[PDB]
């Protein structure tokens, strides 16, 4: 449930020769739904712009 | 909670879930499917706890290692740890002992996503000043208590998480907004939470704008002249790996 303690994970990739022009923004929500499933949570809502896909989550 | 996805990174913040290391394999797959290369992984881990505030360090290090087939590992500040696979801005606040007149607004008998109810909450608490109408926002008020908000504005994000339990109330703030002086940003968040104590962690690489200023003696907004109701303690600067620097300041409300 939603209670302390807070947790945080960040993964940064290098864009290199051969990387897809859009990087991680090449993926649609199916990829991120499965990521969130791994912590037994789900997407409550979404906001997107040209730079960021933002997801609010809940168990 | 929150997941943010950008061209070159993923940020996941949660409160009360199972370990986020569970997400590392699929995030790495997402990187490899677009032919990127993982460069940094960082995770929060509490080795040392104080009264106002999981696996062991060894267990989390072993788990993270198991998700990869080399790198260097160590602390950033004392509560976050990195893996760096050798071949921007980030400011975070942690706040303890939240204003009790404010925290009632983050109790609810129903889960409520962005809507009229969270609009009332944001206006009543002043979150509307932190996340003004230049941002695209979405939020969630939890039952019995707790609150999360994400906001985006071009390449910038802000996010706040609130766990207002009376015994050890807590809130966090994070943003990648670039400013030369963060005092207005930080003090705007303090206006909402008026906490008994808080810390600010800022990244200060010499080749970043804020870091170039800091490394040349500039004022960046964390300094005591901006916090007259607080006493500063134990500023700590670390070059946590060659070329990369972190600053932590700590403030306690004058009794
Ligand atoms: Na200070």
Residue numbers in the entry:
A (entry chain B): 27 to 85
B (entry chain A): 401 to 453, 458 to 473, 477 to 494, 504 to 671
Authors' text:
AdoMetDC is a pyruvoyl-dependent enzyme that catalyzes formation of decarboxylated AdoMet, a substrate required for biosynthesis of the polyamine spermidine from putrescine. The AdoMetDC pyruvoyl group plays a key role in the catalytic mechanism and derives from an autocatalytic processing reaction that cleaves the peptide backbone into β- and α-chains.
To facilitate crystallization, we created an additional deletion mutant TbAdoMetDCΔ26. The inactivity of TbAdoMetDCΔ26 is explained by an autoinhibitory mechanism mediated by residues S27-G30, which block the active site. This configuration places F28 within 3.8 Å of the pyruvoyl overlapping with the active site of the previously reported HsAdoMetDC structure. The TbAdoMetDCΔ26 autoinhibitory residues are well defined by electron density and form extensive interactions in the active site stabilizing the observed conformation. These interactions include, π-π-stacking between F28 and Y243 and H-bonds between the side chain of E85 and the backbone amide of S27, and between the amide of G101 and the carbonyl of E29.
